[PDB]
Amino acid sequence: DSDFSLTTFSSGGKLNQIESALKAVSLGGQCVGVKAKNGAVIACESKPSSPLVEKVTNLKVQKINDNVGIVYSGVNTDFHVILKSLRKASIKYSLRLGVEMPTREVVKHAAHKMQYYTQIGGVRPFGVSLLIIGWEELGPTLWQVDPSGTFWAWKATALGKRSDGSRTFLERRYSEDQSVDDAIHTAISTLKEGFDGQLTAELIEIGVVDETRKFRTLSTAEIRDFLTE
Amino acid sequence: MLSIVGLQGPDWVLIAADSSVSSSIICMSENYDRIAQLDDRHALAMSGETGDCLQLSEYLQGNVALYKFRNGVELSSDALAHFIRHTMAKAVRKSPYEVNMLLSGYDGKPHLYFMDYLGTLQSIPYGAQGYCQYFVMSVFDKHYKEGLTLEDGKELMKLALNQIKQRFTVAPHGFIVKLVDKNGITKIDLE
Amino acid sequence: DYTRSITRFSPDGRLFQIDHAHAAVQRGTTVVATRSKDMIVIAVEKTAVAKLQDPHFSKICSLDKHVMCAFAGLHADARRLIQSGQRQCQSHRLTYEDPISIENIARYIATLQLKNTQSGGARPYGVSTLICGFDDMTSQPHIYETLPSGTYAEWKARTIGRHDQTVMEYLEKHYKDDMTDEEAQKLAIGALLEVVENGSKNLEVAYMKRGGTMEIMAEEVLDALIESTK
Amino acid sequence: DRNVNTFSPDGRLLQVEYAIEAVKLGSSAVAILCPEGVIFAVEKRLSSQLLIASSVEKVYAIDDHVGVVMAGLAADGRTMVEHMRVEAQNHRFSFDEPIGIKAVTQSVCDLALAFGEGRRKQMSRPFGTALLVAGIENGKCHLFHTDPSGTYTECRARAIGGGSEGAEALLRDLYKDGMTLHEAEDLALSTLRQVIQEKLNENNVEVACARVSTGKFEIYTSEQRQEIVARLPP
Amino acid sequence: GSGYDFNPITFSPDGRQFQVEYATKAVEKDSLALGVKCKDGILLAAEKNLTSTLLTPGGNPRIFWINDSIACATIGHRPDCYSIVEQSRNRAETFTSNFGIKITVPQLASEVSQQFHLAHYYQAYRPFGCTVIFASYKDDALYAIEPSGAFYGYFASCFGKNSNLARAELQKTEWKNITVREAVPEVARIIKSLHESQFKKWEIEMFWLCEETNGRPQKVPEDVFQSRFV
Amino acid sequence: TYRYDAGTTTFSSDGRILQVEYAIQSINQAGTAIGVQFTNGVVLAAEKKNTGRLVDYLFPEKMAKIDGHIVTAVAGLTADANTLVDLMRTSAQKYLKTYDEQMPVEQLVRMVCDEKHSYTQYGGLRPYGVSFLIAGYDRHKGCQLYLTDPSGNFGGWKATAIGENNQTAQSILKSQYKDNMTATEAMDLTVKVLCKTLSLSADKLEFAVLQFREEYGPKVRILTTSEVDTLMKRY
Amino acid sequence: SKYDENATTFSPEGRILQVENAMKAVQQGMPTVGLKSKTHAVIAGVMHSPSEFSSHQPKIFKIDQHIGVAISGLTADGRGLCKFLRNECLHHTFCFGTEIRVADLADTVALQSQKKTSKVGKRPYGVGLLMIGAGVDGPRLFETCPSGQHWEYNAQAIGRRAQAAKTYLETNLNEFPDCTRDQLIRHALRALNDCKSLEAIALGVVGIDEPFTILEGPELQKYID
Amino acid sequence: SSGADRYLTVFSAEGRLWQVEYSFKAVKQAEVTAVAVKSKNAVCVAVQKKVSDKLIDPSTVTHMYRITDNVGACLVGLPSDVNFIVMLLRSFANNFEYKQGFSIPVSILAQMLSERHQLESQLVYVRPSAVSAILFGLDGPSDSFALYKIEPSGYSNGFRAVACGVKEIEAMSALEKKMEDFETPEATAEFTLSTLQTVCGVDFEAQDVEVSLLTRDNSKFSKLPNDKVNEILHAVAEK
Amino acid sequence: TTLLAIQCTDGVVMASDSRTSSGSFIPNRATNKITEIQPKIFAARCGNAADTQFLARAVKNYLNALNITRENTDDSTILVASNVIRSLIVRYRQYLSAGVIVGGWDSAGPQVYSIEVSGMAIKKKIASNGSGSTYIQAYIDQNYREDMTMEEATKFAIAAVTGAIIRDGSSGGVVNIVQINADGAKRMTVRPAQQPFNYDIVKG
Ligand SMILES: *C(=O)[C@]1([C@@H](O)[C@@H]2C=CCCC2)NC(=O)[C@@H]2CCO[C@@]21C
């Protein structure tokens, strides 16, 4: 019987397992998200285990539905499980309601699942923080979902390796009036800031929601086109 | 096919029910109180098998008391009516309660609800479950006036029950009539 | 499901979890249940911020039209006990059509607490309950005290919660064998006042008359009785 | 250790021994068997005079013929006597006869040691109550003793509770196989009075007889308890 | 040393499964049982160091029937040994129910190693402190499952105390070149050479699955080889 | 087993569930949430946990709607708050389906507190480290404001606070709270108490105003960022 | 000591210390003796009397017509095992219509005890059973252990002071196969007498044709000599 | 509840799943190295077959398993965990073929194994299965070869060339420093065996290595008989 | 439906018709009633089409399950396929009106098992099933020889299934032949033009 909760409040009201999962996020690979006026962007420094890895097989930037996309930082497998659950929730939402699950609905479902795993017994919290981009009625939206299941809404943020420096960089070099191309440039520059050595289009994955309100992963050609400029 | 008849007035509800309980061809009792006082404010006339009516009445009365005790508030007549409707809607699909009811309640306003085993809930000025409706609805239509006095209401309910007695082949040997008003549910005799 | 046998025996033979539930009770507000030939009275002291909260959250509850119930201890464990007791009163009506015996419902509450002491993965109720009421099947008012251990005992006048020993001493001293209803009211009120330095604005007093429901004492009659006792 | 169903290096169930200790912390109770009947004399601990003595009844009538007195945790004993009552009525229903004293004793004992922890959904700890089960079966009074370990033994005389060891020592040279029910009541009340810390009184004692002549387990009224306490040598 | 040895599913910082290693220690404590594949059949011989002279001669089996074609030598924790024997019988019966044919020692060993592995893979289970050598002539298979759940087919398997020396001695013979009846003296000599002097009374529980047995498991008859020794 | 169990549903030597006390401490480390009852409504205010130059204050974080007549401010773990808000919404809509009536505020508070208590008494799971200021209206008891705890204990409050400097906010309310106040007066009171206890950027604050009108009924409006900014700039 | 946590925990030496504690709990039971002749099997034991005026707790139990078990250890666990064994005999007399073999009962009880020792949250039965059966398998004696194993014996002693009984059985081991029912019962009673610290000794005797029967107190007087 | 971060699969104060890393070291405990190379025309997986005692029937000492006819799996790790993973990958494949109606792709099988290893790394009552899995085969929908590695963490990737076992770091380094777009299946096999031999630092014989060379011709999984393995080894000993 | 599996000396010839019938309507006129369970194990299907296709897919699942714990995947596979067909039919006898002749080649050689709609599995050298098999029972008895090779049995099975196609309305279309030897399975389709007989055999 392991039905007891391994995530429990400490003497001071600090969920030690939540902080541990957040530390796992902090050592899970830097991923940036930038909310532009006419869209949002989520990129990540997806440096493979080796040059022999095939990138497409473990893309960190993924589709949840036609309108919503997700990047993560943390345990890759936890992200894959949450991604399968979010895609299943989106297709269920489409079955019940005929439309792709809204961006904030996707974020709230991811948050609910993560909170569930922070409360039920026999499990650990998901060691990933998710940057989910998608369009709501009032415009594009970027959402951080932490292992605790608490979800921020951000104009821009990084939440992976050296994410404090990258968040200071975003605080210093972000403006709302940025377009989707400007947002992609900002995300790439943030990744460059927090990455050792020259950044390459191979080593980062970018997924954008634009005026079309549809999430699309930029091919390596497009990412290189952005990097060259 | 038991005759329960409800008549809603401006500030009262006269709920009458067949007082003759039966087993097969035998009239076991001539004063069986088919009207269930779920609350001090609500009397639920029930037409159906005596066992189904008794069990449903006890369940509803227990749930009303449990709502009154769990929360320091009594159910309204609309809230109770829709709770009964929810119970019947659950039952019909799975384990149906074969009871057609008239819920008469006074919670500061008179209320009379036509409820059936399926779960059709309708606030009515007057109504009946059983075959008696086929005999009493017209008399109500013919003789009901808005603002009817309680004495005129008793006269009209007496007329409806007399029509049940005279024209319905299975004439109930008697009726139990209850006045549901600001003073609660009081059993009355219409003569 | 989770079954960690929260309640286990200690080497000295004590259920430490029951001791801790009793401690939780003893940090609860004082309750004083007294009885007369025909009327029972319950007086719970209330700690509250009079200028910023509603005093309508009562420790005294009505399990049924004949079963009155007060508690000392965790308000949530008490809410669960009261909810289950009300469900049981209505289920006893469903199964028997007779009002549940005060001994029966007190036994049920004590058995709920006991099952929490016996069920794995279940925390003993940190609540001691005063199940009072009237039985027509016995023609006797009853006041049972169910403990977190799951033991229930009928009392002529019992108190629970904080200051329970002082109020018990007051009850023992000022108890009459054949009190009138107003004498029971005076005993309960004075016993609660012995530890409370405030009048009607603090105390909460309810009562149940023979063949009657639970009536909460007004803030005018309660104050009059408080002054009369003093 | 740290789990309820753990064996000490001495080969003892630690929770079982601790429940035995809990029984040793309970009120005293002396069961004296004699050919006329089995007599329970039980210390009713009254923390106050306001405590209704009849409500802290340590004696429970399992059936018309069989009864039980508890020592230890009154709530665990309530569970045990509830199980015994259900078993006695089920036996009457299934076999049209009173349940044997040994049979109901064995049933409650089987219930006693069914405690467990660590498995998905049962009681979580042994009953902290020892019962003195006694009753009339086939025109004979049978007295049995159940302890938290789940073992039951037929007894001519037994003691459970705080004074259990001292009561047994006093019963050593005081109990005989041919005593009359009068003498059995006298011995039970004397042993209890000796092993309690308060003067014996009809209100702080509970006496009950599984009487062969009546074939029934009755609980004595205040008048009968006075009729016994009056005869005692003190 | 460190705390990684209490939970079976816990991995030591060196990747060691300490509970599995202790189950293997339990296997190594037990008297050696071995199996050899031979021309005419497979011979399973279990050394039984009789703790008491009162033990039934020829009783307390270590070789067990699993199927009308499969026998099972057992080493280690005898409770776990017979638990795995009965689980192998149940797995063979379930295999017949699902597929109609009789199970083979390779896939029987896989199915039982599944339970072996589940023991130390999911919490709430104890790793089986037993090594089970499944032999079947009709499958020409001698698969030994270890406490971890690692199962290998052997030409000559052996586990228990002095198992390394027993395997070294089994290595000296090309067992498939000879039949079971001439393998019995060789294996008996091996175990007698490795038999420890401290155990005065003991037995060699030999079984064989051969053409002479029509592929059915059968204890080596006493006339062929008196299993009992002093 | 149970070596690494925290005894979440176990009592302490003092008699208090240490996981509920740690949850209460976690709430005391969370953004202040204040509720104030006025004549025909209740104003809830809260401090957002996520407050940065980059954080996009798109939707309420500490404020949630349970039904057309019930809104909740929360102090503590926002994730547990979202879970219990989903449960409260489902319970209120269940009561509406069953009775065709809006769920009484005290019964929804009792439902969320039964959930939170069940997590403190059964299942060995972590308690809900959230304190709800459940404002709402029901015909039975008018407009009400309830303060829930991780223990599952709730109490009606004329005005109360939770979170960081909850005692300071409670003292300020006690010194300043009046009865039968207007919506504007109560909202200004909440602004004053927040400003004293809590920086102070309008976008860092959330406001919701339950208001019962005999004509429209019980209407819950969680003030938008523009409304919160306009309301705070007036102090 | 530190590994004596659960029946599921192996000590670094391969020992289940909780299993060993249950085995000791069996070794703390009253002296139990079992014997086996070619025609009859016997289980005897000095029943325990917790108090002077308490009766001796029954120790010999009749599982089936030709099967009986003598418990040593927690008598409540012994009764639970007796219930399980009687259910197994009733499901073998239901499925097959004949009496189960005591060897099969030993297998089943060993399996149950092992499942108690292999899954967490369960304790090994604190009772060891001397089971004697008679049937197509002949008379057979099995000492079932808490660990989940049964040892077949021609004779055996368990519980307290069982070394003297074991020594007696070893001395007379070769006599038992030809010993008659009366002589096997006499050997049982004279192996228990060496353990004496009769009305305490209860003895269940079974034969290939004789159904299992329990003799206690004066009924055994004829077998003392 | 503190202290479970090292004994159970929950994050430590530094945010690491210590049990996962220890399952990686348990994979290292297999005393065996696997090297898989994928080319446009074939995928060759060679894993050293170290039989400690020759009393063991070598045909049972296998780290290469038939999940499906098209999908093979070279599993390096604890032998019990390896057998559990062969039975769990075969169960995945059968369930997938029963539902979707076609043989499971290597990518989907890798995803399912990663999901299982994530349930192991999250469910604290489940041990992380200490098996580094090299799944390989010819995917029909793309008619191209797939080569995935799933680590005990569940970290699954597609590889042009991958390695597992004791020399995983050195083998991967040699692979990346010498990977080529080979034009023949036998050049892929030669590179596979040469890298494995070099990193293991010992000369190989067919007895000492299991090699499966799935070509466009022989797409179905099968461990190469000793003849072909010896031929490839001689080709690797040429230069 | 006409099913005719012949266990030859050198293989198994599974002949079938290609006519799925919904009353007097033929929804599918080119039906593959012989399903490839494994490369050398095929299941000729008669009775309810849905039940037989479920049976084929479930037996594929069961035979893959047989291979979860074993490496001799081509051992006793046909017998196990027949056993699982039989256990699914008896388990679902109320809901599955399916008869299956499973034939092929495995380690045991060529095999042909006829599991009836009742769920009776019989290893048969010559097995036939379906409505059309009735019309050709005597023809088979007169023209079937135990010593027929896979080519002789293929010709005879084409002739018999063609006769059944001619005389049965439920049986028609092309003669789906499957020839399973040790090397593998060869599918053939005998179209009505290439069928040895025609409707003209009726009335001479
Ligand atoms: C044949 O059995 C038949 C076909 O539908 C057949 C079913 C199994 C394989 C696919 C096609 N089943 C039927 O229900 C009709 C009536 C008799 O033969 C059929 C054509």
Q: Identify the sign of the CA torsion E210, E214, E220, E221.
A: negative
Name the nearest CA neighbour of H18 among H32, H39, H3, H35.
H3
Q: Which of residues 71-130 of G touch F (CB under 8 A)?
A: 120-121
Q: How many Å apart are CA A2 and CA A9, to the nearest integer?
A: 18
User: What is residue E61's three-state secondary structure?
Assistant: coil
Distance (angstroms) between ligand 1 centre and the Cα of G186 equals: 78
Enzyme catalytic residues of I: 1
Q: What is the DSSP string of G12-78?
A: TTS--HHHHHHHHHHHTSPPEEEEE-SSEEEEEEE---SSSSBPPPP-EEEEETTEEEEEEE-HHHH
Name the nearest CA neighbour of G43 among G108, G134, G113, G112.
G134
Q: How many Å apart are CA I172 and CA F182, to the nearest integer?
A: 88
I108 interfacial to chain E (CB closer than 8 Å): no
Chain H residues whose C-beta is within 8 A of a chain I C-beta are 66, 68-69, 87, 90-91, 93-95, 97-98, 101
CB atoms within 10 A of CB F12: 16
Q: How many Å apart are CA E25 and CA E3, to the nearest integer?
A: 18
CB atoms within 10 A of CB F152: 26
Is there a contact between C98 and D62 (Cβ–Cβ < 8 Å)?
no
Give the residue from F2, F4, F125 with the most H CB atoms within 10 Å of its CB, the best one to mutate: F4
> H8 to chain A: which residues are within 8 Å by CB?
6
Interface partners of chain E (CB pairs < 8 Å, 3 or more) are: A, F, G, H, I
Q: Kindly determine whether residue F124 and residue A14, on different chains, have CB atoms separated by under 8 Å.
A: no
**Ligand 1 atom at minimum distance from I46 CA:** 2
Instruction: State how far the alpha carbon of A207 is from the alpha carbons of A62, A180, A221, in Å.
Output: 8, 11, 13
Tell me the two tokens of residue G63. 């599982």
Distance (angstroms) between ligand 1 centre and the Cα of I48 equals: 6
Q: Kindly determine whether residue H101 and residue I64, on different chains, have CB atoms separated by under 8 Å.
A: no
D86 interfacial to chain C (CB closer than 8 Å): no
Interface partners of chain H (CB pairs < 8 Å, 3 or more) are: A, E, F, I
Instruction: State how far the alpha carbon of H237 is from the alpha carbons of A47, H39, H172, in Å.
Output: 35, 21, 21
> I62 to chain E: which residues are within 8 Å by CB?
98-99
CB atoms within 10 A of CB D90: 12
Residue of I29, I46, I116 to test ligand 1 pocket, by largest number of atoms within 8 Å of CB: I46
Q: Kindly determine whether residue I70 and residue E98, on different chains, have CB atoms separated by under 8 Å.
A: no
Name the nearest CA neighbour of H214 among H202, H227, H228, H194.
H228
End-to-end CA distance of chain D: 49
> E49 to chain G: which residues are within 8 Å by CB?
none
Q: C8: which residues sit within 8 A by CB, 6+ positions away? A: C15, C16, C17, D4, D15, D18, D117, D124, D125
> E79 to chain G: which residues are within 8 Å by CB?
110, 113-114, 117, 145, 147-149
Q: How many Å apart are CA D100 and CA D95, to the nearest integer?
A: 11
Q: Kindly determine whether residue E98 and residue I62, on different chains, have CB atoms separated by under 8 Å.
A: yes
User: How far is the alpha carbon of B79 from chain F, nearest alpha carbon, in Å?
Assistant: 4
Distance (angstroms) between ligand 1 centre and the Cα of I17 equals: 9
CB atoms within 10 A of CB C111: 19
Q: How many Å apart are CA G123 and CA G146, to the nearest integer?
A: 9
Tell me the two tokens of residue C13. 């033979």
Q: C221: which residues sit within 8 A by CB, 6+ positions away? A: none
Q: Identify the sign of the CA torsion C174, C179, C183, C186.
A: positive
Half-sphere exposure of A177 (CA within 13 A, CB side): 0
Q: Which residues pair with A207 in a beta bridge?
A: A42, A217
Half-sphere exposure of A21 (CA within 13 A, CB side): 33
Plot region of C133 (φ>0 → left; ψ -120 to 50 → alpha; else → beta): left
Chain F residues whose C-beta is within 8 A of a chain G C-beta are 1
Q: How many Å apart are CA E220 and CA G54, to the nearest integer?
A: 53
Q: How many Å apart are CA A228 and CA A181, to the nearest integer?
A: 13
Interface partners of chain G (CB pairs < 8 Å, 3 or more) are: D, E, F
- DSSP H helical ranges for C97-180: 102-118, 164-174
D6 interfacial to chain F (CB closer than 8 Å): no
- The whole-angstrom distance between residue D138's C-alpha and the CA centroid of its chain comes to 21
Instruction: State how far the alpha carbon of F26 is from the alpha carbons of C81, F23, H34, H83, in Å.
Output: 28, 5, 50, 46
Name the nearest CA neighbour of D134 among D37, D231, D18, D46.
D37
Q: In b/e form, how buried is each residue of G167-186, taking b as 16+ CB within 10 angstroms?
A: ebbeebbeebeebebebbbb
User: CA of E100: which chain I residue's CA is closest?
Assistant: I83
* Cα angle for residues G117, G119, G125 (degrees, 5° grid): 35
CB atoms within 10 A of CB D24: 18
Q: How many Å apart are CA I70 and CA I107, to the nearest integer?
A: 14
Q: What is the DSSP string of I33-86?
A: -EEEEETTEEEEEEE-HHHHHHHHHHHHHHHHHHTTS-S-TTSSHHHHHHHHHH
**Ligand 1 atom at minimum distance from I33 CA:** 9
Question: H-helix or E-strand containing B158?
Answer: helix B150-167
> D120 to chain A: which residues are within 8 Å by CB?
1, 3
G6 interfacial to chain F (CB closer than 8 Å): yes
Q: In b/e form, how buried is each residue of B57-78, taking b as 16+ CB within 10 angstroms?
A: bbbbbbbbbbbbbbbebbbbbb
Phi then psi for D115, rounded to 5 degrees? -80, 145
Q: Kindly determine whether residue C20 and residue F12, on different chains, have CB atoms separated by under 8 Å.
A: yes
β-strand pairing of D29-34 with D157-160: antiparallel
The label of the residue with tokens 């690692």 reads E150
User: How far is the alpha carbon of D113 from chain F, nearest alpha carbon, in Å?
Assistant: 21
Q: What is the dihedral angle through the alpha carbons of H168, H172, H174, H177, rounded to the nearest 10 degrees? A: -160
> A108 to chain F: which residues are within 8 Å by CB?
82
User: What is residue A206's three-state secondary structure?
Assistant: strand
I117 lines ligand 1 (CB under 6 A): no
Q: How many Å apart are CA H3 and CA H10, to the nearest integer?
A: 10
- The whole-angstrom distance between residue B69's C-alpha and the CA centroid of its chain comes to 24
User: CA of E3: which chain F residue's CA is closest?
Assistant: F3
The coordinates were experimentally obtained by cryo-EM
- Atom 7 in ligand 1: which residue has the minimum CA distance? I49
Question: H-helix or E-strand containing B55?
Answer: helix B50-70
Tell me, yes or no, whether chains H and E touch by having 3 or more C-beta pairs under 8 A.
yes
The label of the residue with tokens 């912390």 reads D25
Is there a contact between E190 and E36 (Cβ–Cβ < 8 Å)?
no
I52 lines ligand 1 (CB under 6 A): yes
Is there a contact between H56 and E43 (Cβ–Cβ < 8 Å)?
no
Burial class (CB in 10 A: 0-12, 13-18, 19+), A5: buried
**Ligand 1 atom at minimum distance from I47 CA:** 2
I77 lines ligand 1 (CB under 6 A): no
Tell me, yes or no, whether chains B and I touch by having 3 or more C-beta pairs under 8 A.
no
User: How far is the alpha carbon of F117 from chain E, nearest alpha carbon, in Å?
Assistant: 28
User: What is residue B88's three-state secondary structure?
Assistant: helix
I31 lines ligand 1 (CB under 6 A): yes
Q: Which of E97, E100, E107 sits opposite I69 (nearest CB)?
A: E107
Is there a contact between C13 and D19 (Cβ–Cβ < 8 Å)?
yes
> D2 to chain F: which residues are within 8 Å by CB?
2-3
User: What is residue G177's three-state secondary structure?
Assistant: helix
Distance (angstroms) between ligand 1 centre and the Cα of I120 equals: 19
Interface partners of chain F (CB pairs < 8 Å, 3 or more) are: A, B, C, D, E, G, H
β-strand pairing of H64-66 with D140-146: unpaired
User: CA of A1: which chain E residue's CA is closest?
Assistant: E124
User: What is residue C67's three-state secondary structure?
Assistant: strand
Q: What is the DSSP string of chain F?
A: --TT---TT---TTSS-HHHHHHHHHHHTSPPEEEEEETTEEEEEEE-S---SSB---S-SSEEEEETTEEEEEEE-HHHHHHHHHHHHHHHHHHHHHHSSPPPHHHHHHHHHHHHHHHHHBTTPPP--EEEEEEEEETTTEEEEEEE-TTS-EEEBSEEEESTTHHHHHHHHHHH--SS--HHHHHHHHHHHHHHH----GGGEEEEEEEEETTTEEEEEEE-HHHHHHHHHT-
Q: Kindly determine whether residue B65 and residue C90, on different chains, have CB atoms separated by under 8 Å.
A: yes
> B75 to chain F: which residues are within 8 Å by CB?
99
Question: H-helix or E-strand containing G108?
Answer: helix G102-118
